[PDB]
Amino acid sequence: TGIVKWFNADKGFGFITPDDGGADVFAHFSAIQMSGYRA
Amino acid sequence: MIREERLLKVLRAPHVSEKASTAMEKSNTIVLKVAKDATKAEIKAAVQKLFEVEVEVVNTLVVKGKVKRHGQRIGRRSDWKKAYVTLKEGQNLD
Amino acid sequence: MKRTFQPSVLKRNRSHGFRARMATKNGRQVLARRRAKGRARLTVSK
RNA sequence: UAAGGUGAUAUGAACCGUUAUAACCGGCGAUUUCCGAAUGGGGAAACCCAGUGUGUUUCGACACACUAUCAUUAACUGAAUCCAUAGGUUAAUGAGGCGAACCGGGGGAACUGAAACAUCUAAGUACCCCGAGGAAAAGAAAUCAACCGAGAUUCCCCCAGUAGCGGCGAGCGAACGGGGAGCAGCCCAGAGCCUGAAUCAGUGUGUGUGUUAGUGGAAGCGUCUGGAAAGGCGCGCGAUACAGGGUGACAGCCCCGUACACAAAAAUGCACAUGCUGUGAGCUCGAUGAGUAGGGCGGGACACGUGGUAUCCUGUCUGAAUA
RNA sequence: AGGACCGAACCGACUAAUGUUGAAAAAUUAGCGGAUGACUUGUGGCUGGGGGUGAAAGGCCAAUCAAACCGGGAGAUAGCU
RNA sequence: CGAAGGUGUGCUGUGAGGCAUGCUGGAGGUAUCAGAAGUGCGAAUGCUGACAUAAGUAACGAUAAAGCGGGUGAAAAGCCCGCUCGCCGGAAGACCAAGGGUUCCUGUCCAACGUUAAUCGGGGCAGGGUGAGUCGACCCCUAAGGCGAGGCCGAAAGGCGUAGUCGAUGGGAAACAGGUUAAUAUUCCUGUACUUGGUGUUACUGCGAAGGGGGGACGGAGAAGGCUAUGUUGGCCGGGCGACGGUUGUCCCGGUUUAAGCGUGUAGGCUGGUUUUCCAGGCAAAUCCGGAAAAUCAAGGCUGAGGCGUGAUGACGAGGCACUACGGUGCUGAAGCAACAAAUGCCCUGCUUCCAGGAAAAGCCUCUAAGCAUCAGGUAACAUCAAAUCGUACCCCAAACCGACACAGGUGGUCAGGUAGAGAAUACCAAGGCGCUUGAGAGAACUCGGGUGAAGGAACUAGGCAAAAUGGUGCCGUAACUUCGGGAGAAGGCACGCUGAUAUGUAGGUGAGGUCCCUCGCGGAUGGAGCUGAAAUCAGUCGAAGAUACCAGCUGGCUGCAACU
Ligand SMILES: [Mg+2]
Ligand SMILES: [Mg+2]
Ligand SMILES: [Mg+2]
Ligand SMILES: [Mg+2]
Ligand SMILES: [Mg+2]
Ligand SMILES: [Mg+2]
Ligand SMILES: [Mg+2]
Ligand SMILES: [Mg+2]
Ligand SMILES: [Mg+2]
Ligand SMILES: [Mg+2]
Ligand SMILES: [Mg+2]
Ligand SMILES: [Mg+2]
Ligand SMILES: [Mg+2]
Ligand SMILES: [Mg+2]
Ligand SMILES: [Mg+2]
Ligand SMILES: [Mg+2]
Ligand SMILES: [Mg+2]
Ligand SMILES: [Mg+2]
Ligand SMILES: [Mg+2]
Ligand SMILES: [Mg+2]
Ligand SMILES: [Mg+2]
Ligand SMILES: [Mg+2]
Ligand SMILES: [Mg+2]
Ligand SMILES: [Mg+2]
Ligand SMILES: [Mg+2]
Ligand SMILES: [Mg+2]
Ligand SMILES: [Mg+2]
Ligand SMILES: [Mg+2]
Ligand SMILES: [Mg+2]
Ligand SMILES: [Mg+2]
Ligand SMILES: [Mg+2]
Ligand SMILES: [Mg+2]
Ligand SMILES: [Mg+2]
Ligand SMILES: [Mg+2]
Ligand SMILES: [Mg+2]
Ligand SMILES: [Mg+2]
Ligand SMILES: [Mg+2]
Ligand SMILES: [Mg+2]
Ligand SMILES: [Mg+2]
Ligand SMILES: [Mg+2]
Ligand SMILES: [Mg+2]
Ligand SMILES: [Mg+2]
Ligand SMILES: [Mg+2]
Ligand SMILES: [Mg+2]
Ligand SMILES: [Mg+2]
Ligand SMILES: [Mg+2]
Ligand SMILES: [Mg+2]
Ligand SMILES: [Mg+2]
Ligand SMILES: [Mg+2]
Ligand SMILES: [Mg+2]
Ligand SMILES: [Mg+2]
Ligand SMILES: [Mg+2]
Ligand SMILES: [Mg+2]
Ligand SMILES: [Mg+2]
Ligand SMILES: [Mg+2]
Ligand SMILES: [Mg+2]
Ligand SMILES: [Mg+2]
Ligand SMILES: [Mg+2]
Ligand SMILES: [Mg+2]
Ligand SMILES: [Mg+2]
Ligand SMILES: [Mg+2]
Ligand SMILES: [Mg+2]
Ligand SMILES: [Mg+2]
Ligand SMILES: [Mg+2]
Ligand SMILES: [Mg+2]
Ligand SMILES: [Mg+2]
Ligand SMILES: [Mg+2]
Ligand SMILES: [Mg+2]
Ligand SMILES: [Mg+2]
Ligand SMILES: [Mg+2]
Ligand SMILES: [Mg+2]
Ligand SMILES: [Mg+2]
Ligand SMILES: [Mg+2]
Ligand SMILES: [Mg+2]
Ligand SMILES: [Mg+2]
Ligand SMILES: [Mg+2]
Ligand SMILES: [Mg+2]
Ligand SMILES: [Mg+2]
Ligand SMILES: [Mg+2]
Ligand SMILES: [Mg+2]
Known part of the structure; x- marks a missing residue:
């Protein structure tokens, strides 16, 4: 899930730093996998 | 003072929550996010002054x-x- | 088997902590070395 | 100084501002939680527990300040013990800690080399400790020289890998003298006479020069290729500016700049100048650094390893004369 | 009563087999010894490197010990490869 | 109008090389002659990265075990639901400390991590969640030990250490039951309590310490007795009348719970009380302690498990009654007794005994000193206020800790059901929790772990290695030797089940009703109901076998060494 860039609770909307669960972010996690793997 | x-x-x-809604409707207790250095007496004085409402007792916990x-x-x-913050009976708050 | 690290925070801080380092002369030289190297965690102490 | 802004990843939202308290830059200020020399006591750093005093109180209690240690000074007090002294307490001033190198000092290696190794070397090196400053240290001849003379200290080039030292091995290695950089001399051990007289320090003021934001800053068009011209081909112009960087390919003339010309409300350095405060200047007559020099023993430093070994230092025992 | 007896917990580790790029940088399985004592265990503490400690094997001192580890002298030296 | 670089081709030189050009690429390159080098790599068990090989091989982590139906879903051996099966059950269950630090719960996703798939997850992402006067910490107190004003010592650094100050693993006030959340509860709610400080009134009036004394305050082993936790049975209440012969009964299943506190003061343990006088002691004092006397009374006091009553007309409670988003939510609610057995828990910090002779300090109680003198303070009641801060989720013998792993290892404390059993062994089960994150087949050699084995029975072998065997209780009986304790469980042997009788269940244990007495109660006799209940003898009876399973010594002889543990 996008982490919240910021969320207007006025009507419960707003923008969200789209960590999105970001398998892309977790793809950086997989890069970390290779890194600590190399370690 | x-x-x-x-x-x-x-x-x-x-603090909005299902547990907070339960305590508000059953035990007549509101759930507040307070300053970290705040004590129970400072909280009871704040609710008794700034909300104009009768406080029975204050229970606190620290969220990690x-x-x-x-x-x-x-x-x-x-x-x-x-x-x-447990309000006394009869008191009501938005 | 019983391995060599059986943790205890009290013994960790009494042995390697900040005030134990600051107590003696050589321990103060340790903190001067870690500041010169630029360590983020200067000691154990959280 | 300004027409654009509310730091970044990083949009967006809600807003500010456009001729001047929008923003930005700089100067002086204000705030500056907690730990940390940490300094109220403690402590497993960022935590625990207080005391006194002055204020408030809607009596529930809040707020603020102070309280470390040591050195020095002063006051009061004050034992055994008469005075006394030790000791106690207050108060004031200061210190404390950190930090790259350089510097001075107190200690002080070994590997290695010697084709082994113990004297020696490595090396007074590495390292530890103490203390200081922007430099420190040293420093104004009980010095050299050679019968001529020089004239504090420090640094550089020579002298010279010389003279020497040395299991005379490995290796260590000057000085005199010469050329230069830079140059500066003074005071107390003491009275007087004239008395505040030089200089220095401090503090002001004033001027100049910087620094900490900044301002202006020249001069090119057309055409071809090409995604794009700064490129090619033409024709001009600037230059105390063809340093440099960027712009859709390589730009003196697009931009930022550069040369050059200026600029500071405020703070500050440095120069001068001067006020004030303190400081003494000069002349005469004197005086001329004693457990010291030197010595014995043991070590150390001098290039010099005790040698025929001068000189210097001193742990120990002694111990002069004194222009 | 007992450094008494048999025997679980607990402590230990005699034998065999497995495993030996293991399940495991020393273990499992079946048996084995002690088990009120010179017992065992938890927490905290103390002893520091030519030093500690040691019912003593040159044993142990963080999977490292006929002198720990780390950093430095240090690019030790290497007539050897 | 296409540089370097990359990739080809052609040509050329004796060689290191050189030139041209095609393609890619899309912006730099550089003649000549001189100059300077981090100037040319195939090796150094060279360094770094990438990719091979063995090889789609070994393995997929305890041989506790799975099968089916339905669901979801793109897809199901692994997820959810359900019915069966199996495993632990002194643990493979539950609660914690340490340690970790959000792993907790909900929604959602499946790339990666999960030794397979994954719709699942301790994985990713988002949200939510930890509530205390009584639990714990902090705090008061100190141990070992550390620091250490001054101080003593030391080239410096610094070492030791007084007053002190830290330091738990130990001492110090107080809360229980029930209910509830997706996730916290002795923390919330309901009920009922408790503690310590304050201030204030009122009565009363010796208060006072950095000092004195007491207390805290302490060992090992052993023996019983009293209890309780808890269990069993009976009774009671509710339900049932049985898929296959029988089962209205001497039948089956389930339930039968209740706290802190307050009052009583018991079993039982210790103890002589009381008054006055005096006193070289306790740094001074003391009314306190200690010590001398005298008098009086034998009977006062301290401690104390449990029980009983209350708490409790309550709560809980099998089940029902109803709605239902099938999760649930609401309402109602019977009986709720007795006997026996019984702890390693409690009385017990006790009693007895031994030698190896068994923390400190504060809190608490008391005494006075200076001081205060009618003020302060003291305790007594009542009222009122306060009790802060931090922790609290989750794992915790483990997939979350130490082991590089979701590792067959290691890890301190607490609870301790049933049947058999001496037992916390062991076997089967309960509560509760799991089936160990690859499966499906086949049923070769060989290996691993086991089962049985003709005849023989150590001939194997370095060697009876390993296996096999023995194994219990009771009784009989038991050698050399000896330090007189032993050896010795020597060796060796007999009995062992079930049923009936003795005795419709005995001896024994427990002990009611009832009655009597009393200085009256948690009393003392008597009394035996009821419950429980070995062991033995006799007769019979079954099987090949009765310590039938698990469990559970092989024995003896000679000798070396060391006394032994
Ligand atoms: Mg409350
Ligand atoms: Mg911004
Ligand atoms: Mg402080
Ligand atoms: Mg301190
Ligand atoms: Mg040597
Ligand atoms: Mg040497
Ligand atoms: Mg040599
Ligand atoms: Mg000087
Ligand atoms: Mg400009
Ligand atoms: Mg311009
Ligand atoms: Mg280009
Ligand atoms: Mg002189
Ligand atoms: Mg001399
Ligand atoms: Mg001499
Ligand atoms: Mg001499
Ligand atoms: Mg002398
Ligand atoms: Mg024994
Ligand atoms: Mg075993
Ligand atoms: Mg035994
Ligand atoms: Mg040996
Ligand atoms: Mg080791
Ligand atoms: Mg050593
Ligand atoms: Mg050595
Ligand atoms: Mg060297
Ligand atoms: Mg080398
Ligand atoms: Mg091309
Ligand atoms: Mg190039
Ligand atoms: Mg090319
Ligand atoms: Mg090319
Ligand atoms: Mg190569
Ligand atoms: Mg080669
Ligand atoms: Mg190679
Ligand atoms: Mg392959
Ligand atoms: Mg093969
Ligand atoms: Mg194969
Ligand atoms: Mg295979
Ligand atoms: Mg598995
Ligand atoms: Mg497996
Ligand atoms: Mg299925
Ligand atoms: Mg499976
Ligand atoms: Mg299932
Ligand atoms: Mg089973
Ligand atoms: Mg996480
Ligand atoms: Mg979960
Ligand atoms: Mg979820
Ligand atoms: Mg998939
Ligand atoms: Mg997978
Ligand atoms: Mg998760
Ligand atoms: Mg709390
Ligand atoms: Mg507590
Ligand atoms: Mg306390
Ligand atoms: Mg102490
Ligand atoms: Mg000390
Ligand atoms: Mg001192
Ligand atoms: Mg202390
Ligand atoms: Mg303390
Ligand atoms: Mg403790
Ligand atoms: Mg839970
Ligand atoms: Mg006392
Ligand atoms: Mg009972
Ligand atoms: Mg039937
Ligand atoms: Mg039938
Ligand atoms: Mg029944
Ligand atoms: Mg009761
Ligand atoms: Mg919990
Ligand atoms: Mg468990
Ligand atoms: Mg697993
Ligand atoms: Mg495991
Ligand atoms: Mg059991
Ligand atoms: Mg068992
Ligand atoms: Mg087979
Ligand atoms: Mg067999
Ligand atoms: Mg046979
Ligand atoms: Mg046979
Ligand atoms: Mg043979
Ligand atoms: Mg034979
Ligand atoms: Mg055998
Ligand atoms: Mg066997
Ligand atoms: Mg023999
Ligand atoms: Mg022996």
Whole structure:
């Protein structure tokens, strides 16, 4: 899930730093996998 | 006598929750997010002055902050404090 | 088997902590070395 | 100084501002949680527990300040013990800690080399400790020289890998003298006479020069290729500016700049100048650094390893004369 | 009563087999010894490197010990490869 | 109008090389002659990265075990639901400390991590969640030990250490039951309590310490007795009348719970009380302690498990009654007794005994000193206020800790059901929790772990290695030797089940009703109901076998060494 860039609770909307669960972010996690793997 | 400026800097926000809605409708207890250095007497004075409502007792707990990973960078949220403020019977608050 | 690290925070801080380092002359030289190298965690102490 | 802004990843939201308290830059200020020399006591750093005093109180209690240690000074007090002294307490001033190198000092290696190794070397090196400053240290001849003379200290080039030292092995290695950089001399051990007289320090003021934001800053068009011209081909212009960088390919003339010309409300350095405060200047007559020099023993430093070994230092025992 | 007896917990580790790029940088399985004592265990503390400690094997001192580890002298030296 | 670089081709030189050009590429390159080098790599068990090989091989982590139906879903051996099966059950269950630090719960996703798939997850992402006067920490107190004003010592650094100050693993006030959340509860709610400080009134009036004394305050082993936890049975209440012969009964299943506190003061343990006088002691004092006397009374006091009553007309309670988003939510609610057995828990910090002779300090109680003198303070009641802060989720013998792993290892404390059993062994089960994150087949050699074995029975072998065997209780009986304790469980042997009788269940244990007495109660006799209940003898009877399973010594002889543990 996008982490919240910021969320207007006025009507419960707003923008969200789209960590999105970001398998892309977790793809950086997989890069970390290779890194600590190399370690 | 607790000073009004501190009493104005004590309270941060109300905490919305299913448990908070339960305590509000059953035990007549509101759940507040307060300042971290706030004590029970400062909270009771703030609700009794700033909300004009009769406080029976205040229960507090410290919430430990979670550890998050924004993208791939690790991070940790702040510890915050939560107060269960039991109002006396008959008192009502928005 | 019983391995060599059986943790205890009290013994960790009494043995390797900040005030134990700041107590003696040589321990103060340790903190001067870690500051010169630029360590983020200068000691054990959280 | 300004027409654009509310730091970044990083949009967006809600807003500010456009001739001047929008923003930005600089100067002086204000705030400056907690730990940390940490200094109220403690402590497993970022935590725990207080005391006194002055204020408030809607009596629930709040707020603020102070309280470390040591050195020095002063006051009061004050034992055994008469005075006394030790000791106690207050108060004031200061210190404390950190930090790259350089510097001075107190200690002080070994590997290695010697084709082994113990004297020696490595090396007074590495390292530890103490203390200081922007430099420190040293420093104004009980010095050299050679019968001529020089004239504090420090640094550089020579002298010279010389003279020497040395299991005379490995290796260590000057000085005199010469050329230069730079140059500066004074005071107390003491009275007087004239008395505040030089200089220095401090503090002001004033001027100049910087520094900490800044301002202006020249001069090119057309055409071809090409996604794009700064390129090619033409024709001009600037230059105390063809340093440099950027712009859709390589730009003196697009931009930022550069040469050059200026600029500071405020703070500050440095120069001068001078006020004030303190400081003494000069002349005469004197005086001329004693457990010291030197010596014995043991070590150390001098290039010099005790040698025929001068000189210097001193742990120990002694111990002069004194222009 | 007992450094008494048999025997679980607990402590230990005699034998065999497995395994030996293991399940495991010393273990499992079946048996084995002690088991009120010179017992065992938890927490905290003390002893520091030519030093500690040691019912003493040159044993142990963080999977490292006929002199720990780390950093430095240090690019030790190497007539040897 | 296409540089370097990359990739080809052609040509050329004796060689290191050189030139041209095609393609890619899309912006730099550089003649000549001189100059300077981090100037040319195939090796150094060279360094770094990438990719091979063995090889789609070994393995997929305890041989506790799975099968089916339905669901979801793109897809199901692994997820959810259900019915069966199996495993632990002194643990493979539950609660914690340490340690970890959000792993907790909910929604959602499946790339990666999960030794397979994955719709699942301790994985990713988002949200939510930890509530205390009584639990714990902090705090008061100190141990070992550390620091250490001054101080003593030391080239410096610094070492030791007084007053002190830290330091738990130990001492110090107080809360229980029930209910509830997706996730916290001795923390919330209901009920009922408790503690310590304050201030204030009122009565009363010796208060006072950095000092004195007491207390805290302490060992090992052993023996019983009293209890309780808990269990069993009976009774009671509710339900049932049986898929296959029988089962209205001497039948089956389930339930039969209740706290802190307050009052009583018991079993039982210790103890002589009381008054006055005096006193070289306790740094001074003392009314306190200690010590001398005298008098009087034998009977006062301290401690104390449990029980009983209350708490409790309550709560809980099998089940029902109803709605239902099938999760649930609401309402109602019977009986709720007795006997026996019984702890390693409690009385017990006790009693007895031994030698190896068994923390400190504060809190607490008391005494006075200076001081205060009618003020302060003291305790007594009542009222009122306060009790802060931090922790609290989750794992915790483990997939979350130490082991590089979701590792067959290691890890301190607490609870301790049933049947058999001496037992916390062991076997089967309960509560509760799991089936160990690859499966499906086949049923070769060989290996691993086991089962049985003709005849023989150590001939194997370095060697009876390993296996096999023995194994219990009771009784009989038991050698050399000896330090007189032993050896010795020597060796060796007999009995062992079930049923009936003795005795419709005995001896024994427990002990009611009832009655009597009393200085009256948690009393003392008597009394035996009821419950429980070995062991033995006799007769019979079954099987090949009665310590039938698990469990559970092989024995003896000679000798070396060391006394032994
Ligand atoms: Mg409450
Ligand atoms: Mg911004
Ligand atoms: Mg402090
Ligand atoms: Mg301190
Ligand atoms: Mg040597
Ligand atoms: Mg040498
Ligand atoms: Mg040599
Ligand atoms: Mg000087
Ligand atoms: Mg400009
Ligand atoms: Mg211009
Ligand atoms: Mg280009
Ligand atoms: Mg002189
Ligand atoms: Mg001399
Ligand atoms: Mg001499
Ligand atoms: Mg001499
Ligand atoms: Mg002398
Ligand atoms: Mg024994
Ligand atoms: Mg075993
Ligand atoms: Mg035994
Ligand atoms: Mg040996
Ligand atoms: Mg080791
Ligand atoms: Mg050593
Ligand atoms: Mg050595
Ligand atoms: Mg060297
Ligand atoms: Mg080398
Ligand atoms: Mg091309
Ligand atoms: Mg190039
Ligand atoms: Mg090319
Ligand atoms: Mg090319
Ligand atoms: Mg190569
Ligand atoms: Mg080669
Ligand atoms: Mg190679
Ligand atoms: Mg392959
Ligand atoms: Mg093969
Ligand atoms: Mg194969
Ligand atoms: Mg295979
Ligand atoms: Mg598995
Ligand atoms: Mg497996
Ligand atoms: Mg299925
Ligand atoms: Mg499976
Ligand atoms: Mg299932
Ligand atoms: Mg089973
Ligand atoms: Mg996480
Ligand atoms: Mg979960
Ligand atoms: Mg979820
Ligand atoms: Mg998939
Ligand atoms: Mg997978
Ligand atoms: Mg998760
Ligand atoms: Mg709390
Ligand atoms: Mg507590
Ligand atoms: Mg306390
Ligand atoms: Mg002590
Ligand atoms: Mg000390
Ligand atoms: Mg001192
Ligand atoms: Mg202390
Ligand atoms: Mg203390
Ligand atoms: Mg403790
Ligand atoms: Mg839970
Ligand atoms: Mg006392
Ligand atoms: Mg009972
Ligand atoms: Mg039937
Ligand atoms: Mg039938
Ligand atoms: Mg029944
Ligand atoms: Mg009761
Ligand atoms: Mg919990
Ligand atoms: Mg468990
Ligand atoms: Mg697994
Ligand atoms: Mg495991
Ligand atoms: Mg059991
Ligand atoms: Mg068992
Ligand atoms: Mg087979
Ligand atoms: Mg067999
Ligand atoms: Mg046979
Ligand atoms: Mg046979
Ligand atoms: Mg043979
Ligand atoms: Mg044979
Ligand atoms: Mg055998
Ligand atoms: Mg066997
Ligand atoms: Mg023999
Ligand atoms: Mg022996």
